[PDB]
Structures are given as structure tokens and as C-alpha cells.
Design a protein around this ligand. Structure first.
Ligand code: HEC
Length: 303
């Protein structure tokens, strides 16, 4: 709808790989391809060359999209109406690899608005918001090491509020939601499985990934409220037409989020175990967890 790139191709989060080896054989090749693209020389000079590097990458990548899923018996109309409301199409194929395509796609959608009209988002929250991508692909490229954070160029100050440009950021921002939710649901499921299997180094890297993805979502919830407050201001105009309402998430029941909270649940015994084995991620994750829960206020409706 010219506000966002549609349809947004995405995998089925239930089919996400469940262990660290199944994730590596499935996605480490295409993710390492993406990491090479987003860190090829010159890409991090400013915000422009980063967006250009994003497009060269996903262009060069052989698309795996085996088309829309279609008839899904495990999808409810609560998931479908939630997927429709932001132009999401569940796509067949390598669900892990599709997540790399969705991560590259959603980032480019975010970098477009930031190149033309800057961002009044704070330069510290802007880092974790974009750093969540470096975390996802960096960890997807090597699921057995903690991703090392790369540099993220800054955004210019917010220029002129173009008509419904806060709606572009509102829809494009909710795509990053489903990208980071699937990614964070992975590292939690890997953390659960590695802890049960006695894989301490695997539990560490999985916890390091999930934390950087949690901090990435917190900056995403700020980016969302930045546009939802700019939306609330855009509607003081009395409108003789029926006031077109912004698309909202209907309750807790959108598919990727349903999966993430189920993974975070039941991962309780693994965090205490990491804390007992001398880790420092159980601490800084609980920080990122509560910072994300507080950041829902101003973004989610039933909240
Ligand atoms: C409105 C729909 C949203 C959107 C936009 C996001 N979340 Fe989620 N979230 C939502 C609800 C209704 C609740 C339950 C609140 C309550 O029961 O008091 C939550 C809670 C969470 C949690 C806590 C999980 C747990 O307690 O075990 C997490 C970790 C969480 N939400 C994450 C999260 C992230 C990372 C989001 C951006 C991708 C996000 N939410 C958006 C509803 C909504």
C-alpha cells in the first residue's frame, strides 16, 4: 500500500529449528551470506551505504520463497486477521532461511524512512534497535558463538513529518516485530534444549543471542511508540470521512509472539542454571526483559 512492502514473506514459527545443530545446517549458509553483505567494506560509513548493502545482499541471495503457505490447519482467523492487518504472508520453504530473507527485508524497510527523513529516536535506543539485526544474522551465521556487535551508523534528526509517515513506520515497525520475535523464539528454544542436553557453551551463546534480540525489541517498541504517538497527534483533525483507523495487533494472539512467550515460559529452569554455572547473561537479560515489558505501554492496545 506504498506504506510498506507487501506481501511480507515470512516462515511458520512453529516449524522453526529447535536445536543448535538443526539451526546451523539449515541457516548458517544463507545467514553467513547475509552477514558478509551487511559488513562488506564501505557499508557502515553512513546510513545510506548500509541500506545499499542490504539490497545488494538480498538481491544476490537466491530466493527460497516457495510461495504462500495457503491452507493452514494450525492457523486461526485470529492469526490470519493479525497477519493480514500488516501485510504478512506465511511462505512455504526453509523457514529458517525465510527468516534471513524476512530479516533483510524488514531492515531495508526501516532504513528507507531513516535515509529520507531521519529519526528523532535517541541515538542510544537507535543502536539496540538496529543491533538486533546484527545479533540475529550474526548468531544465525554461527549459532555456537555469542554474536559480536558491529558498528551502526547514526540517523539524522527527524525532518518534516510527511503525511502518514508515522504510519509507514508503524507498519514497517511491526514487521521487525515478527522478525525479531521469531529470532528470539529460536535462541530461547536453543537455550532450553542446550541446557537439558548439558550443552553449556551452546546455552551461553543461545542466551547471548536471545538477550541482544530482547534489547533489539525494546528499541523496536520505542520506535513503534514514536510512530504511534505521532499517529495520535495526526488525528486531531476532525474528518468528515470515516476516520481510517491504524491497523492494530488484536491481543496477545499473533503467531510469532504466541511462540516466543511459550518458549520464554518453560525456559525458566535454564536461566537459573546458567546463573549457577557462572554466567552473566541471566542478569543482563532480565534487565532487557523488563525494559521490553515496560516499553509495551504506548504501543500495544490491550496494555
Ligand atoms: C500488543 C498485541 C503487543 C505487541 C505489539 C507486543 N506484545 Fe508482547 N505482550 C502482549 C501482551 C497482551 C502481554 C501479556 C501482558 C500481561 O499478561 O500482563 C505481553 C507480554 C510479553 C512478554 C512477557 C512474556 C512472559 O511474561 O513470559 C514478552 C517477553 C513480550 N510480550 C515480548 C514482546 C516483544 C519482544 C514484542 C516486540 C516484537 C512484543 N511483545 C510486542 C502484547 C503485545
Amino acid at each position: 500500500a506504498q506504506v510498506a512492502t507487501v506481501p511480507f514473506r515470512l516462515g511458520r514459527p512453529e516449524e522453526l529449528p529447535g536445536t543448535l545443530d538443526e539451526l546451523r545446517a539449515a541457516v548458517s549458509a544463507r545467514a553467513g551470506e547475509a552477514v558478509r553483505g551487511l559488513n562488506r567494506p564501505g557499508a557502515r560509513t553512513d546510513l545510506a551505504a548500509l541500506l545499499a548493502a542490504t539490497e545488494r545482499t538480498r538481491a544476490a541471495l537466491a530466493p527460497v520463497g516457495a510461495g504462500p503457505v495457503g491452507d493452514d490447519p494450525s492457523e486461526s482467523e485470529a492469526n490470519r486477521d493479525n497477519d493480514l492487518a500488516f501485510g504478512i504472508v506465511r511462505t512455504r520453504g526453509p523457514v529458517a532461511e525465510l527468516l534471513v530473507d524476512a530479516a533483510l527485508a524488514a531492515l531495508a524497510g526501516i532504513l528507507e524512512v531513516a535515509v529520507d527523513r531521519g529519526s528523532d529516536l535517541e541515538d542510544a535506543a537507535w543502536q539496540r534497535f538496529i543491533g538486533g539485526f546484527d545479533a540475529l544474522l550474526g548468531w544465525l551465521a554461527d549459532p555456537h558463538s555469542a554474536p559480536r556487535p558491529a558498528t551502526v551508523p547514526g540517523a539524522g534528526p527527524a525532518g518534516p513529518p510527511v503525511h502518514q509517515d508515522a504510519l509507514r513506520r508503524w507498519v514497517r515497525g511491526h514487521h521487525v516485530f515478527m522478525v525479531l520475535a521469531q529470532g528470539c523464539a529460536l535462541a530461547t528454544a536453543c537455550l532450553r534444549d542446550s541446557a537439558a542436553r548439558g550443552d553449556l557453551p551452546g546455552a551461553e551463546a543461545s542466551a547471548a543471542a536471545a538477550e541482544a534480540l530482547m534489547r533489539g525489541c525494546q528499541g523496536a517498541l520505542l520506535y513503534a511508540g514514536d510512530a504511534n504517538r505521532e499517529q495520535y497527534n495526526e488525528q486531531i483533525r476532525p474528518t468528515l470521512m470515516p476516520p481510517v483507523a491504524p491497523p492494530k495487533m488484536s491481543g496477545l494472539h499473533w503467531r510469532d509472539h504466541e511462540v516466543l512467550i511459550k518458549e520464554l515460559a518453560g525456559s525458566r529452569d535454564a536461566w537459573e542454571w546458567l546463573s549457577a554455572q557462572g554466567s552473566e547473561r541471566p542478569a543482563t537479560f532480565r534487565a532487557a526483559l523488563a525494559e521490553t515489558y515496560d516499553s509495551h505501554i504506548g504501543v500495544c492496545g490491550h496494555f
